[PDB]
Design an enzyme around this catalytic site. Structure first.
Site, PDB file in Angstrom:
ATOM      1  N   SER A  31      -8.724 -15.582  -5.436  1.00 21.11           N
ATOM      2  CA  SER A  31      -8.042 -14.266  -5.478  1.00 21.11           C
ATOM      3  C   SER A  31      -8.940 -13.260  -6.213  1.00 21.11           C
ATOM      4  CB  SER A  31      -6.697 -14.397  -6.150  1.00 21.11           C
ATOM      5  OG  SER A  31      -6.233 -13.148  -6.632  1.00 21.11           O
ATOM      6  N   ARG A  33      -7.773 -10.423  -7.753  1.00 20.09           N
ATOM      7  CA  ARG A  33      -7.004  -9.978  -8.950  1.00 20.09           C
ATOM      8  C   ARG A  33      -6.940 -11.111  -9.975  1.00 20.09           C
ATOM      9  NH1 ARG A  33      -1.420  -7.154 -10.061  1.00 20.09           N
ATOM     10  NH2 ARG A  33      -0.645  -8.381  -8.294  1.00 20.09           N
ATOM     11  N   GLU A  58     -14.155 -10.699   8.247  1.00 19.93           N
ATOM     12  CA  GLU A  58     -13.536 -10.860   6.911  1.00 19.93           C
ATOM     13  C   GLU A  58     -13.968 -12.194   6.302  1.00 19.93           C
ATOM     14  OE1 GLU A  58     -11.681  -7.203   6.044  1.00 19.93           O
ATOM     15  OE2 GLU A  58     -11.768  -9.013   4.815  1.00 19.93           O
ATOM     16  N   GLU A  61     -17.494 -11.873   4.991  1.00 23.48           N
ATOM     17  CA  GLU A  61     -17.532 -11.040   3.758  1.00 23.48           C
ATOM     18  C   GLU A  61     -16.968 -11.819   2.560  1.00 23.48           C
ATOM     19  OE1 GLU A  61     -17.061  -6.745   6.131  1.00 23.48           O
ATOM     20  OE2 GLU A  61     -15.523  -7.322   4.696  1.00 23.48           O
ATOM     21  N   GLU A  62     -15.849 -12.509   2.756  1.00 23.11           N
ATOM     22  CA  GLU A  62     -15.083 -13.113   1.637  1.00 23.11           C
ATOM     23  C   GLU A  62     -15.570 -14.524   1.318  1.00 23.11           C
ATOM     24  OE1 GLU A  62     -11.076 -10.458   1.702  1.00 23.11           O
ATOM     25  OE2 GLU A  62     -10.798 -12.657   1.771  1.00 23.11           O
ATOM     26  N   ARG A  81       5.000  -7.500   0.900  1.00 22.69           N
ATOM     27  CA  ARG A  81       3.751  -6.702   0.852  1.00 22.69           C
ATOM     28  C   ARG A  81       3.578  -5.883   2.135  1.00 22.69           C
ATOM     29  NH1 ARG A  81       3.588  -5.399  -3.569  1.00 22.69           N
ATOM     30  NH2 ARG A  81       1.486  -4.617  -3.091  1.00 22.69           N
TER      31      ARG A  81
HETATM   32  O1  IHP Z   1      -2.076  -6.521  -4.788  1.00 20.44           O
HETATM   33  P1  IHP Z   1      -2.750  -7.838  -4.985  1.00 20.44           P
HETATM   34  O2  IHP Z   1      -1.783  -9.029  -5.369  1.00 20.44           O
HETATM   35  O3  IHP Z   1      -4.125  -7.826  -5.752  1.00 20.44           O
HETATM   36  O4  IHP Z   1      -3.214  -8.284  -3.537  1.00 20.44           O
HETATM   37  C1  IHP Z   1      -4.313  -7.619  -2.887  1.00 20.44           C
HETATM   38  C2  IHP Z   1      -3.759  -6.788  -1.740  1.00 20.44           C
HETATM   39  O5  IHP Z   1      -2.863  -7.652  -0.956  1.00 20.44           O
HETATM   40  P2  IHP Z   1      -1.303  -7.375  -0.776  1.00 20.44           P
HETATM   41  O6  IHP Z   1      -1.263  -6.378   0.434  1.00 20.44           O
HETATM   42  O7  IHP Z   1      -0.688  -8.820  -0.450  1.00 20.44           O
HETATM   43  O8  IHP Z   1      -0.837  -6.828  -2.087  1.00 20.44           O
HETATM   44  C3  IHP Z   1      -4.958  -6.203  -0.929  1.00 20.44           C
HETATM   45  O9  IHP Z   1      -4.473  -5.362   0.137  1.00 20.44           O
HETATM   46  P3  IHP Z   1      -4.414  -3.746  -0.020  1.00 20.44           P
HETATM   47  O10 IHP Z   1      -3.873  -3.411  -1.360  1.00 20.44           O
HETATM   48  O11 IHP Z   1      -5.963  -3.337   0.043  1.00 20.44           O
HETATM   49  O12 IHP Z   1      -3.720  -3.146   1.266  1.00 20.44           O
HETATM   50  C4  IHP Z   1      -5.838  -7.350  -0.369  1.00 20.44           C
HETATM   51  O13 IHP Z   1      -6.860  -6.873   0.590  1.00 20.44           O
HETATM   52  P4  IHP Z   1      -6.862  -7.467   2.121  1.00 20.44           P
HETATM   53  O14 IHP Z   1      -5.465  -7.427   2.689  1.00 20.44           O
HETATM   54  O15 IHP Z   1      -7.916  -6.669   2.962  1.00 20.44           O
HETATM   55  O16 IHP Z   1      -7.300  -8.966   2.056  1.00 20.44           O
HETATM   56  C5  IHP Z   1      -6.392  -8.077  -1.608  1.00 20.44           C
HETATM   57  O17 IHP Z   1      -7.191  -9.193  -1.292  1.00 20.44           O
HETATM   58  P5  IHP Z   1      -8.737  -9.373  -1.339  1.00 20.44           P
HETATM   59  O18 IHP Z   1      -9.287  -8.810  -2.600  1.00 20.44           O
HETATM   60  O19 IHP Z   1      -8.671 -10.932  -1.275  1.00 20.44           O
HETATM   61  O20 IHP Z   1      -9.326  -8.727  -0.045  1.00 20.44           O
HETATM   62  C6  IHP Z   1      -5.205  -8.689  -2.343  1.00 20.44           C
HETATM   63  O21 IHP Z   1      -5.708  -9.519  -3.417  1.00 20.44           O
HETATM   64  P6  IHP Z   1      -5.662 -11.152  -3.416  1.00 20.44           P
HETATM   65  O22 IHP Z   1      -5.211 -11.668  -2.003  1.00 20.44           O
HETATM   66  O23 IHP Z   1      -7.178 -11.569  -3.661  1.00 20.44           O
HETATM   67  O24 IHP Z   1      -4.934 -11.607  -4.645  1.00 20.44           O
HETATM   68 MG    MG Z   2      -9.138  -9.769   1.810  1.00 20.00          MG
END
Ligand code: IHP
Ligand code: MG
Ligand code: CL
Ligand code: CL
Length: 134
Positions: A31, A33, A58, A61-62, A81
Protein backbone atom coordinates in the site's frame (compact mmCIF):
# COMPACT_ATOMS: atom_id res chain seq x y z
CA UNK A 1 -6.36 12.40 -15.35
CA UNK A 2 -8.96 10.27 -13.45
CA UNK A 3 -11.82 8.75 -15.48
CA UNK A 4 -15.32 7.76 -14.41
CA UNK A 5 -18.28 5.62 -15.44
CA UNK A 6 -21.63 7.38 -16.02
CA UNK A 7 -22.64 6.64 -12.38
CA UNK A 8 -19.53 8.55 -11.11
CA UNK A 9 -17.50 5.42 -10.13
CA UNK A 10 -13.77 5.88 -10.81
CA UNK A 11 -12.57 3.51 -13.59
CA UNK A 12 -9.67 1.18 -12.67
CA UNK A 13 -7.90 -1.91 -13.97
CA UNK A 14 -5.74 -4.46 -12.14
CA UNK A 15 -4.05 -7.82 -12.79
CA UNK A 16 -3.71 -10.98 -10.77
CA UNK A 17 0.00 -11.41 -11.63
CA UNK A 18 0.71 -15.18 -11.41
CA UNK A 19 4.17 -16.75 -11.51
CA UNK A 20 3.00 -19.43 -13.99
CA UNK A 21 -0.05 -20.85 -15.84
CA UNK A 22 -0.59 -23.01 -12.63
CA UNK A 23 -2.04 -19.78 -11.02
CA UNK A 24 -0.74 -20.93 -7.56
CA UNK A 25 1.36 -17.84 -6.57
CA UNK A 26 0.34 -14.18 -7.10
CA UNK A 27 2.34 -10.94 -6.83
CA UNK A 28 1.04 -8.35 -4.31
CA UNK A 29 2.55 -4.87 -3.73
CA UNK A 30 2.71 -2.65 -0.64
CA UNK A 31 0.00 0.00 0.00
CA UNK A 32 1.27 3.58 -0.75
CA UNK A 33 -0.45 5.06 2.39
CA UNK A 34 0.42 2.09 4.71
CA UNK A 35 3.49 0.16 3.46
CA UNK A 36 3.05 -2.71 6.01
CA UNK A 37 -0.20 -3.66 4.14
CA UNK A 38 -0.54 -5.59 0.82
CA UNK A 39 -2.75 -4.80 -2.19
CA UNK A 40 -3.33 -6.12 -5.71
CA UNK A 41 -1.50 -3.83 -8.15
CA UNK A 42 -3.78 -1.65 -10.26
CA UNK A 43 -5.02 1.87 -10.82
CA UNK A 44 -7.00 4.43 -12.75
CA UNK A 45 -7.76 4.11 -16.45
CA UNK A 46 -6.66 7.13 -18.53
CA UNK A 47 -9.01 8.82 -21.04
CA UNK A 48 -9.91 6.50 -23.99
CA UNK A 49 -7.57 3.79 -22.54
CA UNK A 50 -8.72 0.15 -23.11
CA UNK A 51 -9.09 -1.62 -19.72
CA UNK A 52 -6.61 -4.43 -20.76
CA UNK A 53 -4.03 -1.72 -21.70
CA UNK A 54 -4.53 0.14 -18.37
CA UNK A 55 -4.20 -3.16 -16.43
CA UNK A 56 -0.83 -4.02 -18.05
CA UNK A 57 0.45 -0.41 -17.65
CA UNK A 58 -0.55 -0.21 -13.96
CA UNK A 59 1.15 -3.51 -13.03
CA UNK A 60 4.33 -2.41 -14.89
CA UNK A 61 4.31 0.91 -12.90
CA UNK A 62 3.34 -0.58 -9.49
CA UNK A 63 4.87 -4.12 -9.52
CA UNK A 64 7.66 -3.92 -12.14
CA UNK A 65 6.49 -7.04 -14.03
CA UNK A 66 5.45 -7.82 -17.63
CA UNK A 67 4.01 -10.98 -19.15
CA UNK A 68 1.22 -12.64 -21.14
CA UNK A 69 -2.20 -11.03 -20.57
CA UNK A 70 -4.90 -13.68 -19.95
CA UNK A 71 -8.65 -13.62 -19.34
CA UNK A 72 -10.82 -10.94 -17.75
CA UNK A 73 -11.84 -12.36 -14.33
CA UNK A 74 -14.57 -9.77 -13.77
CA UNK A 75 -15.51 -6.19 -12.94
CA UNK A 76 -15.53 -5.44 -9.21
CA UNK A 77 -16.98 -2.47 -7.31
CA UNK A 78 -15.84 -0.88 -4.06
CA UNK A 79 -19.07 0.84 -2.89
CA UNK A 80 -17.39 2.88 -0.08
CA UNK A 81 -14.58 4.29 -2.31
CA UNK A 82 -16.87 4.43 -5.42
CA UNK A 83 -14.59 2.71 -7.95
CA UNK A 84 -15.06 -0.09 -10.48
CA UNK A 85 -12.08 -2.28 -11.42
CA UNK A 86 -11.55 -4.57 -14.42
CA UNK A 87 -9.43 -7.50 -13.11
CA UNK A 88 -7.35 -9.59 -15.55
CA UNK A 89 -5.02 -12.58 -15.22
CA UNK A 90 -1.38 -11.82 -16.19
CA UNK A 91 1.20 -14.65 -16.40
CA UNK A 92 4.50 -12.96 -15.43
CA UNK A 93 7.44 -13.65 -17.77
CA UNK A 94 9.66 -10.56 -17.02
CA UNK A 95 10.63 -9.29 -13.51
CA UNK A 96 12.26 -5.81 -13.71
CA UNK A 97 14.67 -4.85 -10.89
CA UNK A 98 13.95 -1.09 -10.70
CA UNK A 99 10.43 0.03 -11.58
CA UNK A 100 8.52 3.34 -11.35
CA UNK A 101 7.01 2.88 -7.86
CA UNK A 102 10.16 1.19 -6.39
CA UNK A 103 12.23 4.26 -7.42
CA UNK A 104 9.56 6.91 -6.56
CA UNK A 105 7.93 5.62 -3.27
CA UNK A 106 9.95 2.45 -2.33
CA UNK A 107 6.94 0.24 -3.15
CA UNK A 108 7.65 -3.46 -2.27
CA UNK A 109 6.41 -6.64 -4.02
CA UNK A 110 6.13 -10.25 -2.81
CA UNK A 111 4.83 -13.61 -4.11
CA UNK A 112 1.97 -15.18 -2.12
CA UNK A 113 0.23 -18.55 -2.42
CA UNK A 114 -3.42 -17.72 -3.35
CA UNK A 115 -4.75 -18.70 0.12
CA UNK A 116 -2.15 -16.37 1.78
CA UNK A 117 -2.93 -13.47 -0.63
CA UNK A 118 -6.64 -13.79 0.37
CA UNK A 119 -5.59 -13.77 4.08
CA UNK A 120 -3.45 -10.57 3.91
CA UNK A 121 -6.03 -8.71 1.70
CA UNK A 122 -9.11 -9.53 3.86
CA UNK A 123 -8.84 -6.82 6.58
CA UNK A 124 -8.40 -3.60 4.52
CA UNK A 125 -9.15 -4.87 0.94
CA UNK A 126 -11.96 -7.47 1.17
CA UNK A 127 -13.10 -6.67 -2.43
CA UNK A 128 -9.53 -7.48 -3.62
CA UNK A 129 -9.62 -10.72 -1.58
CA UNK A 130 -12.88 -11.44 -3.53
CA UNK A 131 -10.95 -11.21 -6.86
CA UNK A 132 -9.59 -14.71 -6.01
CA UNK A 133 -12.91 -16.36 -4.99
CA UNK A 134 -13.49 -18.08 -8.44
O1 IHP B 1 -7.19 6.66 0.03
P1 IHP B 1 -6.24 5.53 0.24
O2 IHP B 1 -6.72 4.45 1.29
O3 IHP B 1 -4.71 5.88 0.31
O4 IHP B 1 -6.29 4.69 -1.10
C1 IHP B 1 -5.69 5.20 -2.31
C2 IHP B 1 -6.80 5.59 -3.27
O5 IHP B 1 -7.74 4.46 -3.35
P2 IHP B 1 -9.27 4.55 -2.90
O6 IHP B 1 -9.97 5.11 -4.19
O7 IHP B 1 -9.66 3.03 -2.56
O8 IHP B 1 -9.29 5.44 -1.70
C3 IHP B 1 -6.16 5.99 -4.64
O9 IHP B 1 -7.17 6.41 -5.56
P3 IHP B 1 -7.49 7.99 -5.80
O10 IHP B 1 -7.52 8.68 -4.49
O11 IHP B 1 -6.20 8.47 -6.63
O12 IHP B 1 -8.73 8.10 -6.77
C4 IHP B 1 -5.35 4.79 -5.21
O13 IHP B 1 -4.90 5.02 -6.60
P4 IHP B 1 -5.37 3.99 -7.78
O14 IHP B 1 -6.86 3.74 -7.69
O15 IHP B 1 -4.91 4.56 -9.17
O16 IHP B 1 -4.65 2.62 -7.54
C5 IHP B 1 -4.23 4.53 -4.19
O17 IHP B 1 -3.41 3.44 -4.53
P5 IHP B 1 -1.96 3.40 -5.11
O18 IHP B 1 -1.09 4.37 -4.40
O19 IHP B 1 -1.73 1.90 -4.75
O20 IHP B 1 -2.06 3.66 -6.65
C6 IHP B 1 -4.89 4.09 -2.89
O21 IHP B 1 -3.85 3.68 -1.97
P6 IHP B 1 -3.56 2.12 -1.54
O22 IHP B 1 -4.42 1.16 -2.45
O23 IHP B 1 -2.02 1.92 -1.88
O24 IHP B 1 -3.65 2.02 -0.05
MG1 MG C 1 -2.74 2.08 -7.92
CL1 CL D 1 1.92 -19.85 -10.23
CL1 CL E 1 -10.85 -2.43 -3.35
Amino acid sequence: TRTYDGDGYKKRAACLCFRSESEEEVLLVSSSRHPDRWIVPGGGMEPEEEPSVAAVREVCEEAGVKGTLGRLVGIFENQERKHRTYVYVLIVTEVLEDWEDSVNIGRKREWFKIEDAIKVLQYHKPVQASYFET
